[PDB]
Amino acid sequence: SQSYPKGSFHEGHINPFADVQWISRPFMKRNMPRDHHPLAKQHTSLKAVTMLDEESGNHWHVLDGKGRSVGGLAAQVVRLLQGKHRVDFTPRTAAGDSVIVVNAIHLKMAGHTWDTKVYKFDRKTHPAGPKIITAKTIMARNPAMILNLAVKRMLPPNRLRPIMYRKLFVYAGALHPHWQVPQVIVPAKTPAEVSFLPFSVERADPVQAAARIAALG
Amino acid sequence: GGSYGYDAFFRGAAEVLNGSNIQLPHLPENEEQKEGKVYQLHSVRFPPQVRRLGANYFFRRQRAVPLTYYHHLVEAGVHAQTGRGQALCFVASANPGYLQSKELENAVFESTRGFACQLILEGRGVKAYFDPEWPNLMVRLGVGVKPLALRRLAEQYATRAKIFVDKRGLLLTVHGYDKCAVGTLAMSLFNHLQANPYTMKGAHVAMHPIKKKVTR
Amino acid sequence: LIALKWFRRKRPPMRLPKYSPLSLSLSIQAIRGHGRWGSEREFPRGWDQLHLKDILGSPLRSE
Amino acid sequence: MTTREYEEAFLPRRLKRIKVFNTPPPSELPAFFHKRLDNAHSNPRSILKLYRQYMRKDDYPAYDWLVRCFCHLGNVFGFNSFWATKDKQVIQALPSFKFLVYDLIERKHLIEARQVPRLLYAFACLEYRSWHLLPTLLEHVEANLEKWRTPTLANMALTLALLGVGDDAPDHNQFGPPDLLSRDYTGLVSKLALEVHRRLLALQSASSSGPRKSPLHDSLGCMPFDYAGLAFALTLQGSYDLCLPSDETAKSTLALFLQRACEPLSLEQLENSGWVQFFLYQTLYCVDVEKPKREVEVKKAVPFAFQKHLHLSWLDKILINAQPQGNELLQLDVDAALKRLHITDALINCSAGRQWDEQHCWFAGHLVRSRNLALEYDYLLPLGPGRPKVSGWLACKRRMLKAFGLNVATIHQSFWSLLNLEQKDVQLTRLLAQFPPVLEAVKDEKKAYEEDRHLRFQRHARQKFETWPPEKLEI
Amino acid sequence: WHRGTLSLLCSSCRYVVRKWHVPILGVDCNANPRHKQALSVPAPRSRGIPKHLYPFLVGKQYPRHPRWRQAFTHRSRMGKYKPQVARN
RNA sequence: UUUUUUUUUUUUUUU
RNA sequence: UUUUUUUUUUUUUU
C-alpha cells in the first residue's frame, strides 16, 4: 500500500561471500504448497508414461514435472513437440505428439530468479508502454504459464507455432481431466516379499527379564 | 564475469596496497601459532538433558573432525555428589571449539530453568501497576499521560513467557523458556517503553543506560 | 519409450575421497607417535609403531 | 615484449606445445615404484594414486609391492589414530581398493610365511574381513606354529580374537560357499594360548634371561601389552577355564598372563601404560559378571592397589579413549527407519548393567526402555554368500546383555543392503511386533507455562474507538 | 550518514548487513550513533573491457601484413627494363 | 577452486 | 531461525 513488497531475502541469512547469497522461493515459508494430512491411500508417481496408437496415429506422453528445472523441461518438451526424434520428420508439417504435464507448481528456479524476474506484454500504440507482470503473480494465479511461456518462446517463430502450442497441456495439479489416457500417478502397491530374515533375535532368561522389569517398575 | 574493470585494467587495483599501518582499530594478530602444535582428544561430561538433541545434531551435521557422543544412563542433609551413581553424557572431540557451542547449553537450560530479562523504569511519575489480575498489564508514562495497555504482547506470548512487576512498579521482569521469544518480548516492550534523552521518563534495559542531553 | 532417455536417473561412482586440512594433519601426528592416548616416545603405549615393526619384521626364529 | 596469447592467436588452436624438459624414462617399474613408496606413509590419497599409476602402467605388478602397498594403506588407520569407522567404510567402498584386493586374490599362491602377520594386522586395522585369503593365511600360521615368536603369537591371538575367527564354537569356522566349504578352524587361538604357556613353563628350568632390550622387556622378548592382549583375547571368547593338560598343578592361563602383565609395571607407570588399563579392567569386569570356576584364582592376580586405582579413575579417559569414534552409516540408516516408524523411545549409544552397578562397560547401539530391547549392528563381510557371523567385539557384548536380561536383536548389513525404504520399514515393523511394550515411556519435551492455556490471541484485530477522549492507549 | 565506502572508526564496530529494499552493507557503532554508516550511494560503474580482446591489447603489437614490394622489385622482373640489363 | 563468455538477437542457466 | 521487519531487533554461525 505504501512500501515495497517483502522479498524472500527477508526471511533468511545473507552471505555476500558466495554465489547463492540468499535462497529465493515463489512463496513464503508459511505459504508453500503442502499435502493434506489424511491420505485416504498412498500414491506413487510413474515419472513418465507413453501411449502409442497405430490406427489414429496420435501418440501421448504424460510427464511428471515434480522438482524438475523449467528450462530443461521446456527444452525436452520442445523436441517432442517438434517431432525431430522421429526419422520421418517433416519441418513443413507438425510431426509431433501430444504432451501432458502435471505438478507444474513444484518447479524450481536456480539463482535469484523468483524475486528478480518479470514478463512483458506488448501493446499496440500505448503511451504507458508494455504491461509488466511479476512472476509471483503468475505463480499465484496460473502456475502453468511459467512453463507455457518458456515453451512458446522456445518454439520456432513460424505459422506452425500455434499448432504446436495447441497440443501442449499443462496442469498445476496431480491428476488431469482427460478421459482416455493413463495417469502418471497411481495408488501404491504392496511391497514384494523377501526370502530371508535380516534379523537374529535371541531372547534372554525369563527370570532375569522379570527381575529387571520389577526393578525398573 | 568476463569483463576487466578500469581500475584493475589500467590502474591495476593499486588502492588496496595503499593503506597505512597506523591509526588502526585493533592491533595486528600475533603470528605465534606456528609449526609445532600438538593436538589432543578432549572430553567433557554434560548433564543428561543434551540427549534431547538426538543424532541429527551430533552425527548428521558435517564437521571437519569426528564428533563422538555417548550416554551413560544409570538407574535411580547434604548434596554429597560423586562421579558415580548418576547419569550423564560424554562428548569428546579433537577441536575444543566444538565443545563450547551454545546449543548444547541451551538444550539443558531450556528444559531445566530457562532464561530471564529485566527492564528498569525511571522518571517522575512513571509507575507500572497491575489490573485486577493477569493477563492485563498497564504502564503509566508520566503524570497526566494516559496509560499503555500491554495485553496484546502477553496474549501473543502466552505460555512461552511471563511478565512480573515488583510491588513498587519500577521493574519489569520477563521469564521464559525460549531464548528468542524472551528476547523478542523484551525488545518489543522496550520499543514503546523507551526513555526520552531529555526528560528521562521511561524504561531501559539493565546495564545499558541512556546518556543525558542539554539544549544549547 | 527410448525417446524419454532424459528422465532416467544416474549416479557416477566415487573416484577418490576428500579430507580436510586438519584431518590430514592429525594423520601424520598420529604416525609420528602422538596418538590419542599420549606420547609413544615419552612412554611406550599400546599398538605402538616401533614394537610392531620389530615383531612383524622378524616373526620367524633362527634355526 | 610480447605475450603468449598474442603469439598463440596466430597459430592453429590444436597445435601441440613443445617440450622444455626431457629425461630418460624409468626402465624398471618395480624398482622405480619401491623408492616412491618410501615417501608416502600418512596420506591415503598418495598411496591410492601410486597404486592406480602402477596398475595403469602394468597389468601384473609385483606381488611384494602389492602386499607392501596394502600394508601401508592399512597402517594409516591404526588403533591409536583419530580416523573414524566411516572413513574405513567409504575407503572399502572404493573401486581401486577392490581391484587391489582382487589382484592379491588372483595370485594368492605367492604369499610368503613372513607376510602373514602383516596381512592379519592390516585386516584388523581396516576392519575388513575376507573369505578369499584368510583360509590360506591360517594354513601357514598353523603350519609354522612351532616357529613363531611369543610376541607374534600374542599379537596374532589378539587380532584373530578381534576378527572373531578361531573360536571354540563348533561348525562356526568354515569359509566359502555352502556347496564348497574349506577346512574347519575351530579352536585356533587356544593353540597359541597354550603354546605360549608351555614355553613359559619350560623357561623356568633354564632360567637364562640374558641381555634385555629394556626394563619392561621380558626374557622371551614379550611385553605387558602383549600379555594383556592375550588375556583380553581369552576373555572375548570366554575361555576362562583354559588350562594346560601337561601341567600337573593345573594352573589357569589367564591368571599367569595377568600376573606377568602386572609384575613389571608399578602404580606410577600404570597411569601411562595406556591400553593395559582398559584390558585389565574389562577382563576383571567380565570375569566378575560371568563368575567362572576360576574366579578366585583370576581375581588374585591383579594387586589390590592396582584394582583400586583402575576402579577410581575409569570414567574420565579410559572409558572414552577405547571406544569407536565418528559416525556410522548402518546405525544412521536404522535410526532414520526408527524415526520414520514413530519411535521416540529409542536411545542411541545407551549403556546398561546390573541393579547394583555404578559403572557400565558397554554401550548398546539403539536401546529402548518401553519394549526392553537392544539393537546391534554388524557390518563385517559375511563368511560367504548368506553365512554371516558376529564380530568378536559384539560376541562378548551379546553375552553381557543376555546376563543383564535384555533381549538382543542384531541386523546384518549383507541382508540389510538388499532392501528398499519400503521393505526396510516392513521388516523393522515385523521385528518390533515381537516385542510389545511393557514399561511406561519417558518424555523429555519442552517446559512451558500450562496455566495460560485458556488465553487467546487475535492478530487481525482492529483498534476500537468507542469514545473520543481515550482513557487508555491500546498498542 | 550515507557514504561511498565503509571504515572501522570505533573500537567495537561490526560490519553488518541491513534488510532494506536491497541488500546493503553497513557499519554500526555502539559508543557513538553518529558513526553509523550505510553504503548506499556508490559511484557509477564503468563499462569493462571484454576478456577475449586481451591478446591484442597488451604487449608489442606487430604489423599484421609485412612489407615486401619494395624489396621484391627488380629490373629483370619487368619487360620494359629487362633488355637494358647487361651481365658483361 | 574449476567448467559459463559482451550469451549484450530471444529462451535458458537445466552443473 | 521466529509475519520480528517504513531508517528498529533476537537466536544460532549454517
Added chain:
RNA sequence: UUUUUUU
C-alpha cells in the same frame, strides 16, 4: 565423466 589440499 569435476579437480586440489607435501612429509
Added chain:
RNA sequence: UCCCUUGUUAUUGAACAAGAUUCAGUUAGGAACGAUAGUUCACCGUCAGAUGUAAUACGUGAGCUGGGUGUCUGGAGACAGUUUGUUCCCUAUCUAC
C-alpha cells in the same frame, strides 16, 4: 524521492512550535493573477494556490500568429466514431444401363 501531503520513534548544535542534509514506494491526490513590452534576469504590487526543473526538430506552422536582437478540395499509416446475417441481389444441373 521533482514544490506540498507519507516513513509513529534516536542523522542532528531535535526542550515545544517553526526548521536543515540524506535515503526508501505497490508512482496516490494537487498547485491563482496583473502593469511596463528592454528578445530575460535581480527586484517591485495582489489572492498568500504558500522557496513552484527538464526532454520531446522553438515538442506542436499541409492548427492559428506577432512593431525583425506564399499557397494547397486528404490517395496510403496512425488516432477518434460506425458496421444485421448461415439465407432473404444474380448464379451454383447428381449417378450413368
Added chain:
RNA sequence: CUAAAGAUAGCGUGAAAGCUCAAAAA
C-alpha cells in the same frame, strides 16, 4: 600466589573522580 604495568593508547568531568587497553599471569 608469582610475575608484570606506557608519563599514559582509547572513554569520562567543571578543576576532579572513575572505567578500559597495553604489559604480566593463566
Added chain:
RNA sequence: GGACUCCUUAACUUAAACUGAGGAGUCAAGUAGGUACAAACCGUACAAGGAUUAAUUAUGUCCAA
C-alpha cells in the same frame, strides 16, 4: 592531387569520421560464407557453364539451428 584498417609519427583539448606524411592488405573494380541488421574485418584449392558427392576453416557442438 582517395575512403577504412595495421605500425611509426606531425597538429589538436594525447579530443573528432577531421588536417597532413613514411610502407603492407582490402574496397574502389569481389560473388556466395562468418561477424544479429548497409562496401573496408577473417577465410577462400576465391563466381565459363550443368547435376540430389567426398573434404579440417573463420568457427561451432542445451533450444530457436
